Homo-oligomer: A and B are copies of this chain.
Amino acid sequence: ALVPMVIEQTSRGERSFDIYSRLLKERVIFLTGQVEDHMANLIVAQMLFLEAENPEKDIYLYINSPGGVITAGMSIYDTMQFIKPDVSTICMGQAASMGAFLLTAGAKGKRFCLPNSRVMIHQPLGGYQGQATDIEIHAREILKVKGRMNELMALHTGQSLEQIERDTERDRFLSAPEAVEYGLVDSILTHR
């Protein structure tokens, strides 16, 4: 039982469903651990799946992630901005680096985090080996990406671009109330 089964009744149901599939039916998607390509590829498939089932209802994305690969993370970002229904992101545990990036990309007014969570942000990392000419090419590309990520932060958070530029120079840690004040999330959930 790495993943338990649950039972529900419907018409003639019966029907048992891996607990994660049971939650997919409620339009809940979890994003956890490192952001990479196979994982990201799967999340995008889930979002398209929910979009087709009912274009008029919200999708809930639970985020608990230390960070990951930018390209993979951008695949998720662009789908969220394409599909018709809102995606409401909820941060639990942590949202660091690319994880924080996706957290703020949720529908405005619907970005929420739990009270003991942590959010951390910082400029992108990378590297390269080779001839001086190739080093130049690769250095230019990473700088362009840094610039693009900053524009998107400013767009989604409401901060000026320069303020974003200064704040990501070195790892910046924010507590849940700080994320609200800064503009990464709209509110903190407390008790039902």
Contacts and interface: CB of A to CB of B under 8 A. Distances in A.
A137 interface: yes
A23 B45 contact: yes
Contact of A41 (B40, B64, B118): B64
Interface in A45-81: 45-46, 48-49, 51-52, 62, 64-65, 71-72, 74-75, 77-79, 81
Q: How many copies does the complex hold?
A: 6
Contact of A93 (B21, B37, B189): B37
Interface of A: 1-7, 15-26, 28, 30, 32-33, 37-38, 40-42, 44-46, 48-49, 51-52, 62, 64-65, 71-72, 74-75, 77-79, 81-84, 92-94, 114-118, 133-134, 137-138, 141, 144, 148, 170-173, 175, 189-192
